[PDB]
Ligand SMILES: *[C@@H]1O[C@H](CO)[C@@H](O[C@@H]2O[C@H](CO)[C@@H](O[C@@H]3O[C@H](CO[C@H]4O[C@H](CO)[C@@H](O)[C@H](O[C@H]5O[C@H](CO)[C@@H](O)[C@H](O)[C@@H]5O[C@H]5O[C@H](CO)[C@@H](O)[C@H](O)[C@@H]5O)[C@@H]4O)[C@@H](O)[C@H](O[C@H]4O[C@H](CO)[C@@H](O)[C@H](O)[C@@H]4O[C@H]4O[C@H](CO)[C@@H](O)[C@H](O)[C@@H]4O)[C@@H]3O)[C@H](O)[C@H]2NC(C)=O)[C@H](O)[C@H]1NC(C)=O
């Protein structure tokens with residue numbers, strides 16, 4: 140109940156919201172059916188429109204007008220945004236030359252440059268080039284300020300998950316807004332686009348920017364606008380707030396546009412109808428910038444122009460129906476569209492079986508346009524599993540397609556020509572970032588980055604300490620002229636042991652054998668040097684990774700590779716090796732096919748054993764440093780050490796062997812040498828973070844050898860590929876992957892073919908940032924380079940996406 144009989148007189152767009160049943164006058168009151176009786180009359184004036192004309196100049200203030208052109212309007216803070224242009228011979232902001240803003244030029248009483256965040260729904264990255272002709276204000280922000288060619292959204296590339304990631308720096312699995320539609324089984328409650336449930340605070344986790352600011356004594360404009368408040372009024376309200384006295388004036392403001400998303404759904408991303416919405420958004424930017432110029436704030440405020448996600452061509456005829464795969468289609472609930480999420484329709488139905496639903500959805504039709512996954516098997520780069528609101532069964536839908544349960548759903552709910560929500564690597568889903576102002580750099584292009592990084596920067600711009608988030612603070616320092624955040628590298632927690640030869644061969648009873656009994660002062664010196672680290676500078680190019688948790692591990696040196704060997708997990712945490720452009724691939728000699736060799740530096744008790752692998756009928760083993768890339772027949776024996784072995788499903792060894800035998804050499808050819816760091820990952824609770832031993836759900840049968848959920852590789856070379864990876868003077872280039880360690884290759888529909896037709900495609904799907912691997916392993920890489928730490932943080936956030944131009 141609202142007592143709507145109060146009044147908005149002098150309260151129009153008031154900043155502190157009043158609690159029921161008192162009536163509201165804030166920018167959200169409409170959305171709650173709670174505005175005072177006179178809110179439209181007082182607060183949403185429209186008389187005479189939004190622009191001054193010659194004949195209104197110096198008019199007698201008529202308080203009924205939407206905005207004013209009278210002499211007192213500047214001191215009142217309510218001129219039409221074009222007042223000075225029409226009446227005082229001023230130029231529009233867009234017509235002025237770009238002039239560097241070296242320092243904030245702010246009115247007296249401004250404690251800090253205000254931040255204005257102008258967010259545009261469905262603004263596809265390539266609009267910046269393709270619509271450039273019709274967006275002069277936006278093109279001026281872009282060219283004069285700091286811009287990226289695109290900004291990567293989070294998955295799913297839906298509105299609320301992305302807007303809330305922008306607000307919090309968190310992945311959707313952490314902030315809780317995991318879709319535009321959700322069921323939370325703990326609350327037994329549903330979140331929907333339409334309706335009241337979405338307003339309840341229990342959905343919204345983390346700490347969004349407006350709350351961070353308020354806790355730290357920075358005042359925030361109310362960020363949200365009821366849909367029916369026109370854009371012109373939103374802008375005028377912002378400009379009026381900026382004229383408040385110092386102690387009342389917010390320091391951060393948000394404007395949100397429903398366009399171009401609204402038209403893009405109806406017309407497709409490049410429909411001829413899309414020109415007009417782009418022109419209109421540009422005009423709104425123009426109004427804001429002119430308004431700021433009138434207030435003498437255009438060289439004071441930092442402006443961020445940012446999108447939530449892009450827009451792809453999607454029509455009703457490109458829908459897959461679960462009713463064409465499943466017999467029991469009525470026993471499931473599907474969240475449908477550009478992603479699928481499946482759960483049982485009834486929790487009382489004990490013949491619901493996810494195993495058989497996944498199987499019935501797997502590689503069933505030659506050109507199938509979605510792939511099913513248990514959520515824990517989704518590419519780790521999506522960070523889309525650790526929330527009870529995300530259903531165990533997920534469908535990754537191909538770009539340009541939808542999934543629905545039954546055909547009747549698509550016509551008893553073609554209308555639409557555009558949609559979004561697909562994998563956040565997809566080109567059409569990318570969106571925009573421009574920063575303009577004293578704190579941003581001048582005429583600077585920066586590489587693409589992820590939207591999870593922006594909260595930290597918005598906090599930097601306001602001098603706030605960010606709440607704990609998923610950005611990597613400092614990785615976007617290169618966007619900023621000042622207010623950079625200068626982190627220190629994390630402290631190493633565990634120091635390595637450096638074992639020498641401590642065990643005789645006969646102390647080992649591992650059930651391993653090797654044909655290695657063949658018997659030189661010239662080369663005995665050499666092998667000793669190699670075991671003491673003489674080639675370490677060749678194979679460990681960026682320092683040893685730091686271990687950021689408490690554990691017991693050994694560094695092991697070899698001719699061709701160096702490793703950090705965990706006495707707790709019985710295998711390396713990491714294995715580092717460099718392969719030059721000139722390296723040759725060799726085979727595993729016949730007599731060495733089953734060879735595994737005790738490592739006399741490492742106790743029997745801290746070693747794997749071959750008997751466990753023999754007894755475990757499901758599990759085999761692979762090597763981290765590949766025997767195919769040994770530098771010589773004698774060095775090859777090192778690759779068969781028990782300490783270089785890791786457990787592998789035969790199905791996965793198909794993937795791994797092709798990566799090691801074919802792909803590493805290919806990359807070293809193309810990149811002029813590569814340095815490779817590979818290792819296991821254990822993430823049995825799918826939280827994206829290194830498991831402790833007590834979280835491991837599977838061991839090699841009859842042993843304490845833990846089975847990895849994933850295997851990673853980090854592949855580094857020189858950005859200037861005229862320099863070899865091991866003699867690089869400047870910036871680095873990296874690609875990485877986190878491959879799921881699966882007992883079948885059901886994910887790859889073409890896996891009965893030769894590895895050359897499917898393995899590299901799989902690896903590309905599981906591309907990763909170094910930072911993702913850091914979370915998953917508790918390691919910190921690139922500790923010793925010649926590069927600045929901020930540059931290294933940017934490198935660690937890099938994602939190689941394999942999308943075309
Ligand atoms: C991305 O960045 C984020 C933010 O930094 C990272 O997430 C953090 O990770 C931490 C480690 O996982 C985690 O720390 C835990 O916090 C527990 C208290 O949590 C509450 O308080 C905070 C502070 O305000 C709040 O933010 C939390 O918000 C979560 O939960 C509410 C609902 O309750 C949601 O609204 C919100 O969306 C958010 O949910 C997300 O996180 C939770 C986990 O907290 C998930 O379950 C959700 O799915 C969702 O993803 C909370 O309100 C604290 O109690 C924990 O300590 C327990 O666990 C440890 C180790 O397991 C142990 O040492 C302790 O003894 C204790 O265990 C006891 O409880 C266990 C569980 O019942 C029980 O099994 C034991 O036997 C014990 O009794 C722990 O310290 C932190 O909360 C989140 N923060 C956020 C915002 O998500 C994230 O890791 C980053 N991702 C990557 C890939 O890097």
Ligand SMILES: O=C(CCc1cnn[nH]1)N1C[C@H]2CN(C(=O)c3cc(OCC4CCOCC4)nc(C4CC4)c3)C[C@@H]2C1
Pocket residue numbers: 256258260298299302303305306332348362363364366393395400445
């Ligand atoms: O009607 C549809 C959806 C229609 C649609 C589009 N595509 N499919 N359906 N609306 C979607 C609603 C979103 N909205 C907002 O006012 C809004 C803005 C915002 O900004 C955060 C800032 C963004 C910039 O960085 C700082 C954080 N954050 C939130 C929610 C997350 C807290 C909401 C009105 C719209 C009505």
Ligand SMILES: [Ca+2]
Pocket residue numbers: 260261297298299400447448
């Ligand atoms: Ca959106």
Ligand SMILES: [Ca+2]
Pocket residue numbers: 821822823824825826827828829830
């Ligand atoms: Ca984990």
Ligand SMILES: [Cl-]
Pocket residue numbers: 295297317318319320474
């Ligand atoms: Cl959704």
Ligand SMILES: [K+]
Pocket residue numbers: 752753754755756757758759
């Ligand atoms: K076996």
Ligand code: NA
Pocket residue numbers: 884885886887888889890891
């Ligand atoms: Na297959």
Ligand SMILES: [Zn+2]
Pocket residue numbers: 261298400401404559
């Ligand atoms: Zn949309």
